[PDB]
Amino acid sequence: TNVYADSFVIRGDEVRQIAPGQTGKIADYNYKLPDDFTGCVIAWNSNNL
Amino acid sequence: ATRFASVYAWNRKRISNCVADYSVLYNSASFSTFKCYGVSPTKLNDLCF
Structure with missing residues (x-):
């Protein structure tokens, strides 16, 4: 029905926090995913940019 | 600790008769x-052992 694309930059060690039910500085205070999340999480190393 | x-002779320290603050950790x-x-991890500070 609709799709929402969210984008941001984080440390490689923080990508593991971008998942449903996660906690930590990013998941708690920056970007929280719901427990019943229905989307996809895509991430890549940007050390070149 | 300095x-x-x-690991073959892993050290163990008993923690007792004290008040903890796992949120700091x-x-x-x-x-x-x-x-x-x-x-x-988050509820750990609201419990006793």
């Missing part, structure tokens, strides 16, 4: 891995 024990963000089994 020097840790060798979890929110330190100095740890690469912080995994809790059978107890939630």
